[PDB]
Amino acid sequence: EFDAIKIALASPDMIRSWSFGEVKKPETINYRTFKPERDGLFCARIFGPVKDYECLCGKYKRLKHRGVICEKCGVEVTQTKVRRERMGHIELASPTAHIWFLKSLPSRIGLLLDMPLRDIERVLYFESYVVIEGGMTNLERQQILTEEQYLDALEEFGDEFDAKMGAEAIQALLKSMDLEQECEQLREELNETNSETKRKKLTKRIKLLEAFVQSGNKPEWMILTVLPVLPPDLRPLVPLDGGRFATSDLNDLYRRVINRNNRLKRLLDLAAPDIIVRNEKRMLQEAVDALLDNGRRGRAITGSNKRPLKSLADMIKGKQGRFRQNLLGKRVDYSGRSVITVGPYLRLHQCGLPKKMALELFKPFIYGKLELRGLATTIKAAKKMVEREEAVVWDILDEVIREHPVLLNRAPTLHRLGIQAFEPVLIEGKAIQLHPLVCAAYNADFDGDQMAVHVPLTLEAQLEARALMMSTNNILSPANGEPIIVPSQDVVLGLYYMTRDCVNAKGEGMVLTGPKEAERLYRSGLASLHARVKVRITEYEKDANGELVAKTSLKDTTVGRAILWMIVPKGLPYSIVNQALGKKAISKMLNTCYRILGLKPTVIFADQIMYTGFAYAARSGASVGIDDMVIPEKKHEIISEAEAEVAEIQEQFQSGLVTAGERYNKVIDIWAAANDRVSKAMMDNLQTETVINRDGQEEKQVSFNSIYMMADSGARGSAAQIRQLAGMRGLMAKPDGSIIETPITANFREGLNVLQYFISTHGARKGLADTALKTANSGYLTRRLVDVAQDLVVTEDDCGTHEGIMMTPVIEGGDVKEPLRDRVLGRVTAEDVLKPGTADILVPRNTLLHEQWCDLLEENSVDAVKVRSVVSCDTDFGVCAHCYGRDLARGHIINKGEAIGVIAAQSIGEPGTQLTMRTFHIGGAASRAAAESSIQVKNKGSIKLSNVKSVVNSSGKLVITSRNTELKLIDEFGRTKESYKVPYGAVLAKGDGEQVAGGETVANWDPHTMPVITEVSGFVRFTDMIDGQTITRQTDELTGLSSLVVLDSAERTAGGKDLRPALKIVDAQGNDVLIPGTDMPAQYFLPGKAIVQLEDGVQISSGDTLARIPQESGGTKDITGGLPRVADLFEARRPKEPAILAEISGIVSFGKETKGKRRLVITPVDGSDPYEEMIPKWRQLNVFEGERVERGDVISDGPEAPHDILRLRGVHAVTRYIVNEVQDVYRLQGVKINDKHIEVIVRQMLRKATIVNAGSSDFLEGEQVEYSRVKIANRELEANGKVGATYSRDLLGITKASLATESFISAASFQETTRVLTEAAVAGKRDELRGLKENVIVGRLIPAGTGYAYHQDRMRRR
Amino acid sequence: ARVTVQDAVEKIGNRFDLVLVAARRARQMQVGGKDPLVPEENDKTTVIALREIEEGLINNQILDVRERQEQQEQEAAEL
Amino acid sequence: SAAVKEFFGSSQLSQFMDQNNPLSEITHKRRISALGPGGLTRERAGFEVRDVHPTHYGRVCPIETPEGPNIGLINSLSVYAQTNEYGFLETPYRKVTDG
């Protein structure tokens, strides 16, 4: 119906036009009579008739006098619904300011009037004058004064000098302010000045002035002269029991405001003293700006119960405003709620529903069907029959739910599967029967969980629920391609028992014709369930075409597998059943079934699987007992050996040989080894003692213990759980996070000691409270992520670009964390994938990577691939389908319209319930040092050096003169398998391209020594090194030869600051060595804290550590990789010590020492040094004054910052780092997430941009303009001969992206309501509601789902 | 009855246009007063619409052609 | 009188007992809270108050705690725990001589 929404300021004339009257009496209603007042807060002639088609005086009450007003009260007789929109006003006597524009931080007036907010507040609260219309006076026109500064200066000028002390003063200042003149003056000032903070203030002021002059607003409207009022019925006021009425806080606010206004009018009429009227004006200002936003001024006044009062701003902000409570999520009709219950008989596509619930939900459909047949002629008869619930209504209820699905919903909703569609079947009861195979996706246990049910109610809705939200249409999770219908513990335990074959049982060695005969023989009891029998199977194999070739063959399998074969469809082979059929086994079986046979038979296959599993687990009789859990007989001797070891360790400690730390470490490792040994013993015990004679002596087999069947099959029990159960619990934790030296030498089956149980519960309460605290942070993160999301949909089919990202399997740390396949599966290649064979186009561009495609790619041994990405897509206000990839829930390419952002945010926030908040895992919780630089290798390969800069020593090894050097292992096929960071001065015992085996160390480095190793042999001298000025002599004691110490910039006086100690590699003649290739003198300028043990004039070696500069290594820096880690990563917050990079290349030097901190200068050979920087004097310097490094290289060793990464490495490096970090954090826990989600998240995260040079564009250089907008403007300018612009992408934290959006309603729905509302109002912004959330807040179709096409049809109209 | 709609996704380009044309067919069958081209088995309008779509004789182009034809018939009768 | 009445009727600690079984009565009268005046708020509590200390041995139960919004803030007194004259938690112990 209507187009975009426009927001701007409210002119007083506009308010008066809105007003249908003025409230003057502060009374609402009367005590004896409930009729409203004449012109009070609740009026009739101002707002409307309190009753329908009935006036206040009762004169015009018929339906024929409607449309006219009365002669005494003058109330237009109409419906009371008109009271929902009619408003009045209050004529304020002393114009006041708006607390929103005054407490915005930064406030609008504080920046517009170039006046500090402190002085404006002083003027507003009537305690200091401000002058106006200076002119010929000596004072400045905008200067402020106090009472004394006014009384002493009044005698100088009293006719032309005037200074008001109210909001009228700033109102007149606004009215007496020019727009074009000030704009031109500030533009000239910005063009003439050269500063950073001043230029930022000037550009903010000029942007503010441009927003004023461009939009249809006027500054003087900020001073509220008339006050709009809230319609009466919208004001909460209802007759409570008795004379008291339930009122609202806004009622009291308006009451007090009207009272203070009337008192001020009375005081002005009697010509009260100046102090009295100024105090009354201050009180009226307090009243009005508490009505606007109570508590913002500082004093949160209370009305009743001594509680903070509710103002108008409170009704919008927070989790209780209109946006969060009444606009985004509203309560719906035709809904119900009930506790869940296991339904084991219903099919996967359907569900159960209580009879009374189904009756109460579908009352209109029942009424319609009763009126259809000759059963009920009116609605009253049908209602009475439904209330009576005769025998004639139940069949109607069964008919209306014949094919009418409903929606089941879990209370905490994480991903798309939080709401599913199901066909209901009526059941007698008060509980909702649910399918067992979907609750796992619901994450809903049956311990008392309550879920909700909703009705589609519309043909379109029913068809959508049957087509999209149905359970059958959702079998792959949107996060990972893994099927979310993986079987649960009961069915998998039943199947494992059915397939776990023994050695001897009833009917071992016989022959069976088919699976039906096997089932007959089993149910007859003449044979067992699991026994090796030779049967004949008749399997079917899918040929190249749609043919199913049949082959009959004699197999030797267990009776259980043969019986279960009657369930699997014909397409699958027999090798998938001829297994133990564990959890992973049945999961891969279902996956292969869905892959080969599609979706239609997979549903019934899973249903039959679940049915047979339940039936055979019931028939089996699986049960855990006391005798089932066995204790290892040799556990006692292991415990005694462990206690003897700890006793001898304590004896050694008492002997004074070993200290406390090493004693604790030895005790901990001894107990860990003992626990591992006893766990292995328990496992090998639980596996043995299962011997059965089959015409022999002993045929030891797989153990048939029930607890082992439950654990090994992966149904419910894991290895660690059964270890804690049967074996010793092991070690526990103390409050700080350390490990107590006294372990728990008992188990659960055996009696647990009191102190042991106390330590156990102390350790467990931490993990228990962990999730209870972390659920709130996870919900907050999900909300932030979805608010950043939902601003993009698939609006194009192709962008027409070729840029992407170089995806490669990460191999950092161990061998490999994940291959390339899973990182490219479901995507489209940008360029031609180059096989190791030169000039190969085996994978053409613009092609989707299917299963066979990635299989062939892995077969061809491809190391990396340039794959299309979302950050590279050029689609405006959305993304294209040709850049996202597969849907991850459908077996085809992504369609057009589906909101990728919402599903991405959901898939990212779902594992939040499985992450951690805080733990002792701080990276080096055990030990970490640079002495670990002894790098070994597992497999055999050739060595490859990245960033090659190294030389060879006289000892036979290779020394590295750089830090960015990287060691890689090329395998026999050509790919990389091992990657490691080569430290500075590593002892590379190998060479580049050399074939080395696995299991040997190739390099190593000193832990606490920064090497200044040379490059070529020569003679060393004390060049530019004078004793007593730059160095000191601290003699050694145990080394014979003493060490020359160098002081740092903290202890060295000013006498040696201009002298830097250096080392000059000279020859015997006197001339220094020349670096081979260049024409630069070879010298090493050593910084402070240098320990030079080498003498003078001695023949130095090629690459020998001369000055042993001690580093600050030995501490941990791995910030806890929990939910706070990913929160801070997405928020793009800077770490405590940000690892600074190199802005420009070239040499570096130190200039002005102690300019508050250390200084640095970067001078390249190409350009100048236009950028200075401050560096703390407590951070070590990796690069020295003589070393030349490329831009973007680390200087301060520590955690990096994403801002510098993006601004010095491009758009692809920063997103690669982000995705790698977040995937590592998620895989540390064990949860898998496709990279497309985080990719689109970061793409949305860098939506903003800035300008460097305006050029021919209309955007100023100091304006943070949107990326796609300036991009399309640059495109338009490229269509002509003018230069577009100089755009620079800047990264911000996720909370800032939801605010710096062209749509203001989308930001108003988020936090920070008042500031964004004021910013949109002052600029007269108008948003085209182009998105999803705004389309909800307005309440229309969404341009993402089935209605997206509708929106397209709306775009073709205009 | 109907349990899966994968074959419909095979026959139509995607799921959104599929559900749109199914809703159009359901509106034509329920309130439009049109007869189902496939004999029903005590099923609602949605199920028979999905079945007739799966049989391949009804889609968006066919529905537009039928709408144009009924319009032409209206005008021919108005003569 | 009004102050005493409002303290006994409406406060963060005055609450009607969960009269459903004697166990709830006993565990509610022996209930120690960290909320209310002079105490923390469950919204602004760190991981230190929630965790149980080895000094809680015999003075407050470490396994009885309402799981949810307040884990560790609401506890129950130990069986043999007594209130010290100064207002501390005292635990009985048998004196052990040489033999």
Place this chain on the structure above:
Amino acid sequence: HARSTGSYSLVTQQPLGGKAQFGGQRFGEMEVWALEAYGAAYTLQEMLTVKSDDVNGRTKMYKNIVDGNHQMEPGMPESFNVLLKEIRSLGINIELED
């Protein structure tokens, strides 16, 4: 507990909840996110205003359903108009275009 059509709040024409009063359930914000992650544009559009907020839409939908007409009318959410009037009560002017 369940509800077909009961009372509505006075501040805004929205269905109540709870079991004491004959009210439905609350379509939480996470539920809206999950719905818009799927398609079901018409489903959300009816669940938001036609079933909950439309002062003149829910009655029309009920009259159509009891008359065997499964067709809806979007209308406008009442709470949206409440927010409009609340922002208009402040010194800020919001306005819908053509």
Place this chain on the structure above:
RNA sequence: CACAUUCCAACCACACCUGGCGUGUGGC
């Protein structure tokens, strides 16, 4: 002359209710 309506055997219209907001407790 003209505009516009016109107030009374069953009954259609004259129906039915507190999450204002906070706190406390408990459960998932």
Place this chain on the structure above:
DNA sequence: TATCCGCTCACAATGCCACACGCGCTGCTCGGCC
């Protein structure tokens, strides 16, 4: 006078459900159209 640093203020922290409960008193002073 630029510019980093220290102090100060705005804003943020699930979701549902169930139950229970609640709203400064008395007095004084000024003002309104059957």
Place this chain on the structure above:
DNA sequence: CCGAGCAGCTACTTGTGAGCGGATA
């Protein structure tokens, strides 16, 4: 009279981000 407006009888969070001096070269 009635009604309505007003007067005497809080600090274990922590974090993050932005703004306002502020003092030092």
